[PDB]
């Protein structure tokens, strides 16, 4: 009955441990680095085909074909170079909240607000696309579907659980359940070995793809966290929250490294992502603009304010050639 | 341009045309978000007027689509923003549960929460004060004062119903934009869908004239 007191004893022990070996003061090291100054970006192309709000973007491995979600229930695979469309997949469940794209560039994984991550097939003979499988089993609502291979998908659901599926068998081969609140964001690793879950318990967790047991549990936020993205090194990650305080956590040190905060902002963070090098952090706010932060000095670098409504999704290419922000104006802009 | 990129552009335009046509066809339908507290009466009106359950019907040349979210367990604020731009919010309320257990106060809290929500400042509210048939006789023994301390009057359905209706319609902080409609569901008719039609055509006319630069 009293073992919760022993649990909180260990909680204070681990907090004392992680703090006692923390002479970080990260800012007090970055002073030697020369500042990035001020970077401005222009809208190189505008992709305009939708008739409602868009909810998700994902760049293919090609760094050319981006897949974009919608609210009408028509995910359209854009061609980022010539503003051309290739497929207009009409999905059944008109409510969408995420999209994925296969590292090979074959399958598109969609699925929104009715507990069905429905994977599609593009590179097929007999012309048109087809619903390959409808992965069902979740009790809440699908938040983020992400592909590992052409066979294994990991899905952050809304019922406090993360499921690793097997497409060939169409069942939850592995389940991860440590969270108390809705698991709102997922992010894979460059080495694809271990992913990070951002939940509604104001706490980010590091999972293991292979084994299944959580290894790190980072707290420090006051409110919900809405987006995670790994540092391309795979030893740190940014976390955007509803407290307007994107913060970079370290996977090795096992605590928060530094904080990003600007006084006049009271909006929520939607999407965070790093540039290929991993110097500047792209962050999508509710001020109808995306802020480019210096991810080593916390000093604001740039403001891409070219939307009439909030930015719901933000994709950086796997070669760092351009960023693509998806607003609620039924347009998505490709900045560079 | 080039040879096959010229054809690529033809394909782009052709599917853009199909997308515009499908969008036009879908937008001519009207969508009604159907709220309701658990066991209020949400299972009655859904059939009487005939995760997420998209249920559509048609009455007098209009394509009505009821979205009932009551059969989903998640944080409301997270998915509620998805339903912005919906025409009407059918807010079914259990009337008989005034004494059952507090349920009235819980429904009142939910109504206050969703009425003044940041997203639904503009949209009208239709609420059906249902299960009047059992409610009318319930106050012969158990007066309304059990649920409401600050009420003083007669225990007659004709007055009790009117007072509860007034009490619920008082909550909306924005009186000048969003209208509140009210009805008491009657078993013997097709008048419930008639009322829904009347309220929906009213809000549509008002919105169309606002879009017409006159209002």
């Amino acid at each position, epitope marked *: 009955d009293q073992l919760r007191q022993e649990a909180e004893q260990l909680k204070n022990q681990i907090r004392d441990a992680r703090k006692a070996c923390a002479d970080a003061t990260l800012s007090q090291i970055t002073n030697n680095i020369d500042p990035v100054g001020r970077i401005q970006m222009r809208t190189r192309r505008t992709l305009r085909g939708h008739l409602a709000k868009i909810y998700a973007m994902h760049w293919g491995t090609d760094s050319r074909l981006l897949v974009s979600a919608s609210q009408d229930g028509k995910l359209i695979i854009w*061609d980022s170079y010539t503003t051309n469309k290739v*497929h207009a997949i009409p999905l059944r469940s008109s409510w969408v909240m995420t999209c994925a794209y296969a590292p090979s560039g074959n399958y598109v994984a969609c699925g929104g607000l009715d507990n069905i991550c429905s994977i599609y097939n593009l590179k097929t003979r007999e012309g048109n696309v087809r619903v390959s499988r409808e992965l069902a089993g979740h009790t809440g609502y699908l938040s983020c579907c992400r592909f590992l291979d052409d066979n294994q998908i990991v899905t952050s659901s809304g019922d406090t659980t993360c499921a690793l599926w097997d497409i060939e068998t169409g069942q939850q081969t592995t389940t991860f359940t440590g969270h108390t609140g809705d698991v709102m964001s997922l992010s894979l690793a460059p080495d694809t070995r271990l992913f990070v879950s951002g939940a509604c318990d104001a706490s980010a967790k590091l999972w293991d793809v292979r084994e299944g047991m959580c290894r790190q549990t980072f707290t420090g936020h006051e409110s919900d966290i809405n987006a995670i993205c790994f540092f391309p090194n795979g030893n740190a990650f940014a976390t955007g929250s509803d407290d307007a305080t994107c913060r970079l956590f370290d996977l090795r040190a096992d605590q928060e490294l530094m904080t990003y905060s600007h006084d006049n902002i009271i909006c929520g963070i939607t999407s965070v992502s790093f540039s290929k090098s991993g110097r500047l952090l792209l962050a999508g706010y509710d001020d109808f603009n995306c802020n480019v932060w210096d991810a080593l000095k916390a000093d604001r670098a740039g403001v891409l304010a070219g939307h009439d409504n909030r930015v719901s999704c933000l994709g950086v290419t796997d070669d760092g050639m351009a960023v693509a922000t998806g607003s609620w104006d039924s347009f998505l802009k490709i900045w560079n | 341009l*080039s040879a096959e*990129d010229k054809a690529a552009v033809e394909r782009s335009k052709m599917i853009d045309r199909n997308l515009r046509e499908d969008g036009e066809k879908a937008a001519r339908e009207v969508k009604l978000l159907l709220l309701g507290a658990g066991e209020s009466g949400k299972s009655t009106i859904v059939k009487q007027m005939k995760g997420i359950v998209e249920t559509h019907f048609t009455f007098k040349d209009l394509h009505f689509k009821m979205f009932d979210v009551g059969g989903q367990r998640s944080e409301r604020k997270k998915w509620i923003h998805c339903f912005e731009g919906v025409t009407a919010i059918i807010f079914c309320v259990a009337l008989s549960d005034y004494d059952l257990v507090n349920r009235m106060h819980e429904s009142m809290k939910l109504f206050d929460s969703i009425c003044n929500n940041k997203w639904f400042t503009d949209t009208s509210i239709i609420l059906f004060l249902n299960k009047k048939d059992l409610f009318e006789e319930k106050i012969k023994k158990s007066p309304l004062t059990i649920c409401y301390p600050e009420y003083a009057g007669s225990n007659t359905y004709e007055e009790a119903a009117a007072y509860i209706q007034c009490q619920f319609e008082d909550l909306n902080k924005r009186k000048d934009t969003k209208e509140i409609y009210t009805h008491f569901t009657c078993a013997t008719d097709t008048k419930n869908v008639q009322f829904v039609f009347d309220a929906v055509t009213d809000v549509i006319i008002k919105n169309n004239l606002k879009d017409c630069g006159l209002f």
Partner: single-chain antibody
Amino acid sequence: DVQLVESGGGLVQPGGSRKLSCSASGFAFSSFGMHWVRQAPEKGLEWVAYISSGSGTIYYADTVKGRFTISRDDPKNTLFLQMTSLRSEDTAMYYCVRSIYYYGSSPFDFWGQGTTLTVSSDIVMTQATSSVPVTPGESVSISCRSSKSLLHSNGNTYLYWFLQRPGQSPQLLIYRMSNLASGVPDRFSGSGSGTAFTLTISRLEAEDVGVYYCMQHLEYPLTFGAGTKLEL
């Protein structure tokens, strides 16, 4: 799978009239550009007609312009080629050919069996080699020299390599000189630059004997080479 079959062949009197029906079954026909290509009894291929997806654009060859008419029916899934006033140079086999033009697509994939119809400035893809015998087990290169630099500003080199087998419909082998045609063994390798192309068939075995046609796709009309037949 995809089932292209054509009908309305036979023999016609010179100056006559005939229609050729290419019936497509087992794919979304309403989204596919359709080519009509013919073959003389003992000569190389030649381009005849093209129709785009949804009757949006049409193209004809210089030889048959104004005489032939091409039409498509989407709800019945049929392609009609009506010819009138037949000349002695039209006695040929006629194939209706699938094509779909989007980014990273494979046009000219599936070729129908085709029908026999008999009677009583542009690029010249001058395929240099005509005949060469081979032994099984060796690797051999076949080259065809273009008359114009095909490399566009986009960075792509619009050349296709088609293989035809003895008494068969010619199937797509390589598309855009680099990427392998789907359902083809990894033996074939296309290479080259502007105005220089070569298909290297590594460790050549049986079930590869036949004729090889290199075909440009830069402007219209599209032209096939003389071809090279690899003798057993």
